[model samples]
Target: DDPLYDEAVRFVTESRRASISAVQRKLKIGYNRAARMIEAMEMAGVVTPMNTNGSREVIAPA
Candidate 1:
């Protein structure tokens, strides 16, 4: 489980909630995988959608 947990957590911890688009731009990851990672973190109780400006989605979780 460590590897799985590590893999998932690395993505969540390093990810910025600026938005999927922003992360995509910053990380150069594809849209689907980027969003999926956010969704995964959400499901795992690692993060939640906070707000979105006109062009950005914010996510934060304690």
Candidate 2:
């Protein structure tokens, strides 16, 4: 699923911003799945913690 990983990272590469709704929309995933993936991204250190507004602050990959 590295392609998925790359897609998700690209989603936030510029702005370091993402949301479950955006992910779900972009990747055609369910709400819960998108949330879990976001958590996994967090655990993997690709993104910072979630913001109050549901956006994630990312650490763009090099």
Candidate 3:
């Protein structure tokens, strides 16, 4: 459903970090879209669960 899903995966894998703001800034997308991408990444096991402070660690490599 996400057109930028592929690119988002690459970005997270390379960055080794997952944050809604990071994705929003890097991809120039809105908060909702970025949030969706991050959620998708979590579901795919590309990143760990969100931390208390609102960040996630990348678990999968590029």
Candidate 2: regions farther than 4 A off: 1-6, 52-54
Model 2 gets an lDDT of 0.71
lDDT by residue (tens digit), candidate 2, 1-62: 44476676677565456577787888887888777777877887888887787556777554
Candidate 1 lDDT over residue span 1-62, tens digit each: 22243444454456644355554565566787667766666666566654464333334431
Q: After superposing candidate 3 on the true structure, give the runs of residues whose Cα lies further than 4 Å from its correct spot.
A: none
Model 3, span 10-41: residue lDDT tens: 98888876888888999999999999998988
Best lDDT among the predictions, by candidate number? 3
* lDDT, candidates in the order shown: 0.53, 0.71, 0.88
Looking at candidate 2, what is the lDDT of residue 26? 80
Q: Say what the RMSD of model 1 is.
A: 5.0
lDDT of 1: 0.53
- Model 3: clashing residue pairs? none
Ranking by lDDT: 3, 2, 1
Where is the poorest 10-residue window by lDDT in model 2? 9-18
lDDT of 3 at 43: 90
